[PDB]
Every structure is written in structure tokens, then in C-alpha cells.
């Protein structure tokens, strides 16, 4: 809706940074609204959904088991790993790792899952195979969060990842069991949800993944809608701002508030 565009522009002005935005109709994939939809932005932790989609695709193909236990070491632990920090001695199952990676944004969990699939290049190959010609993962956590000026590594476009999310959550790319598991992880309660959850009306559905990185990078991908069912995909990205984190979050949240008000 045009009012949302005005709020996207106001966010650019307040943040001193580009903001990319797309809304899709979930059933049809029709683009309902867009701003800088084909410009590149860092993925940051939004990639963790794509990662777990690649894992679930392997499960469906009999190449991975959700109950397989992954053993790792102290040196595998990277910053912002609140779940994996608690399982050095006992390990974690693949299922537990995806839950941590999505719901808790656990960085080491994502790195371990990347090992299970064979690395960033294998994620990128999975994306290409399902028809995403843009998204790329090149590095692991935390370096993928760098957000360097002029760097194409670890980026997507709003349009590309919106379409990819729709492929993962709807249709037949994943089995029903895997689709539902991915949605369940994305819908699970989180510690704080400033970007969209804070705007979402009661009774509405949201399955989301946020991301935050260096150099102003921030984003969210979501499927949301009224009456306990999703009906739209929304993607919002920004990078480059040196405003405070609170200001970044507030500006993105106001985009979401507009989307809901003008739904
Ligand atoms: Cl535009
Ligand atoms: Cl564009
Ligand atoms: Cl492995
Ligand atoms: Cl959030
Ligand atoms: Mg060991
Ligand atoms: Mg649930
Ligand atoms: Mg809840």
C-alpha cells in the first residue's frame, strides 16, 4: 500500500540507509508492494531459514536424520550461541540445532548445520536448484555478518528471498511434514520480537526470522496473516545505518505497523 512506501522512505531518511521491501500474496506469489526489490542486501541471520530448508530437503530424501546427534568442541563456539554453549559435552540432534538456529538465532548451531550439508557452497547450490538465482552464502557465522561496502558475499535481494520463502513454506518442495516443521520452528515464541511480532494483531499467524549484523545490517523475512493462517510474505532489509540499534528496530517496526494498518 502506498502508505507503507511512505514509511519505508521515512525509514531511509531517519536511518541514513537504504531499505528494501517486498510483499507477496502467499497463494499466488503476486507482488503486492515493493521498494528496491532487486537491490542487494546482506542476509544476516535470515539465511538460517534457508539452511534449515536445505536440511529438511535432505531429510525428505533420506540423506539426513533429524535425530542424528552432532558432537562438537569448544573451539566451534562463536558469539551469540546461547543454546549450543550448553551442549559441548552431550551434543545436539539435527532437530535441536534447527530449533536453536531459527528460534534462538544460535550462530554455532547454524555453523554445525552448514557442516551437515557440506558448507555455504552447498547451501548456495540448493538455492540455485530450487530456482533462486540471486541468494548466495559464502561465509559462516559470524563473518557473514560483516556488511562490508561493495561486498556481494552473503547477500540476497528482497524479491529473491521472498520467492524462496514461499517455495519452502507452500507447495511441494518439502514434504508436508517438513513444511510444517519449518513453519513450527519459525512460529515458535522468541525472547524478543521487535520487528514484526511487536505489530502483529492477536489471533494473527506469523512465522518469521530476523537478522542483525555489522554496519547497520538488519532484516526480517515472514509469512503472516489474519485468523491463524498466513496470507502474505513480507521481507524487509536495510544495511549501512549507523543509527542506534533501537532506532533501526523502531523504524522497521513502523514499516510493519503500516503494513498491518493498511492490510
Ligand atoms: Cl523501487
Ligand atoms: Cl530494485
Ligand atoms: Cl555432518
Ligand atoms: Cl524480530
Ligand atoms: Mg568431541
Ligand atoms: Mg507452535
Ligand atoms: Mg506467541
Amino acid at each position: 500500500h502506498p502508505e507503507t512506501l511512505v514509511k519505508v522512505k521515512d525509514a531511509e531518511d531517519q536511518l541514513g540507509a537504504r531499505v528494501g521491501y517486498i510483499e507477496l500474496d502467499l497463494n499466488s506469489g503476486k507482488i503486492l508492494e515493493s521498494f528496491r526489490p532487486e537491490e542487494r542486501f546482506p542476509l544476516t541471520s535470515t539465511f538460517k531459514v534457508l539452511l534449515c530448508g536445505a536440511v529438511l530437503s535432505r531429510v525428505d530424501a533420506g540423506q539426513e536424520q533429524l535425530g542424528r546427534r552432532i558432537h562438537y568442541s569448544q573451539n566451534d563456539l562463536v558469539e551469540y550461541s546461547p543454546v549450543t554453549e550448553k551442549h559441548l559435552t552431550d551434543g545436539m540432534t539435527v532437530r535441536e540445532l534447527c530449533s536453536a538456529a531459527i528460534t534462538m538465532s544460535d550462530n554455532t548451531a547454524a555453523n554445525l548445520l552448514l557442516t551437515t550439508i557440506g558448507g555455504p557452497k552447498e547451501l548456495t547450490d540448493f538455492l540455485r536448484q530450487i530456482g533462486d538465482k540471486e541468494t548466495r552464502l559464502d561465509r559462516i557465522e559470524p563473518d557473514l555478518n560483516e556488511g562490508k561496502l561493495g561486498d556481494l558475499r552473503d547477500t540476497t535481494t528482497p524479491k529473491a528471498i521472498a520467492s524462496t520463502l514461499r517455495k519452502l513454506l507452500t507447495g511441494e518442495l518439502l514434504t508436508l511434514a517438513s513444511r510444517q516443521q519449518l513453519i513450527d520452528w519459525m512460529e515458535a515464541d522468541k525472547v524478543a520480537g521487535p520487528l514484526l511480532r511487536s505489530a502483529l494483531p492477536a489471533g494473527w499467524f506469523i512465522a518469521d526470522k530476523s537478522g542483525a549484523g555489522e554496519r547497520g545490517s538488519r532484516g526480517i523475512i515472514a509469512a503472516l496473516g489474519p485468523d491463524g493462517k498466513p496470507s502474505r510474505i513480507v521481507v524487509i532489509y536495510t544495511t549501512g545505518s549507523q543509527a542506534t540499534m533501537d532506532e533501526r528496530n523502531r523504524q522497521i517496526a513502523e514499516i510493519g505497523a503500516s503494513l498491518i494498518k493498511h492490510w
Side-chain angles (χ1 to χ4, degrees), residues 1-85 87-120 122-128 130-132 134-189 191-228 230-263:
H1 188 277
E3 295 287 355
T4 307
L5 301 171
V6 172
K7 181 63 230 182
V8 171
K9 292 168 68 69
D10 183 52
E12 293 204 345
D13 175 53
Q14 295 296 309
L15 296 184
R18 301 179 296 119
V19 178
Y21 179 80
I22 199 167
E23 292 169 41
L24 309 179
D25 182 71
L26 180 61
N27 286 353
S28 72
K30 181 168 153 264
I31 299 174
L32 303 173
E33 191 51 272
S34 63
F35 193 82
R36 304 190 192 282
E38 299 192 338
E39 293 196 20
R40 304 198 76 85
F41 298 83
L43 283 153
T44 77
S45 283
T46 71
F47 93 95
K48 291 165 177 162
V49 167
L50 306 185
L51 174 59
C52 288
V55 171
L56 288 167
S57 181
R58 287 165 46 70
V59 170
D60 286 346
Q63 300 297 312
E64 183 57 274
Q65 302 75 46
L66 288 176
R68 185 169 65 104
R69 185 164 295 284
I70 306 305
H71 291 284
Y72 56 93
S73 73
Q74 174 67 52
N75 287 348
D76 294 306
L77 288 168
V78 306
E79 66 177 19
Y80 304 124
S81 296
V83 184
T84 52
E85 277 171 1
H87 295 278
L88 290 173
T89 72
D90 57 326
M92 291 174 64
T93 66
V94 172
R95 189 180 287 104
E96 289 167 344
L97 290 167
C98 272
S99 180
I102 294 170
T103 307
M104 297 299 300
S105 213
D106 188 302
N107 279 334
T108 299
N111 288 352
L112 292 166
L113 291 162
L114 280 162
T115 295
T116 76
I117 76 168
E122 292 290 340
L123 182 55
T124 301
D125 282 3
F126 170 78
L127 292 169
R128 295 292 171 284
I130 68 169
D132 182 333
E134 300 297 343
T135 303
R136 54 184 288 184
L137 197 76
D138 298 272
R139 295 175 292 178
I140 71 172
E141 291 285 5
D143 309 326
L144 67 86
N145 289 327
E146 194 183 20
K148 183 168 176 178
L149 294 176
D151 190 354
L152 304 173
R153 288 177 295 185
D154 312 302
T155 62
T156 193
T157 71
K159 185 182 177 77
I161 196 166
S163 286
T164 294
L165 185 62
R166 178 172 175 269
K167 295 169 176 175
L168 289 168
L169 298 186
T170 69
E172 294 183 319
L173 182 59
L174 296 179
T175 65
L176 181 60
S178 285
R179 263 177 266 153
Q180 186 63 58
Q181 178 64 90
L182 186 57
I183 291 168
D184 287 344
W185 288 322
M186 292 179 69
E187 193 188 1
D189 287 336
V191 170
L195 301 187
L196 293 169
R197 285 167 172 255
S198 290
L200 195 75
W204 285 37
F205 179 103
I206 190 167
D208 61 329
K209 181 74 194 81
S210 63
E214 303 182 74
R215 299 171 183 71
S217 292
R218 195 78 174 104
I220 186 160
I221 71 179
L224 76 174
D227 307 312
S231 63
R232 292 186 199 175
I233 304 277
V234 62
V235 173
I236 313 171
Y237 286 113
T238 184
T239 195
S241 182
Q242 309 192 75
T244 66
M245 190 60 46
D246 190 65
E247 190 70 53
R248 294 173 226 176
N249 288 337
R250 279 180 184 270
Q251 293 299 315
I252 292 167
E254 286 179 22
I255 297 168
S258 178
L259 159 70
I260 297 298
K261 184 169 181 178
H262 301 291
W263 191 267

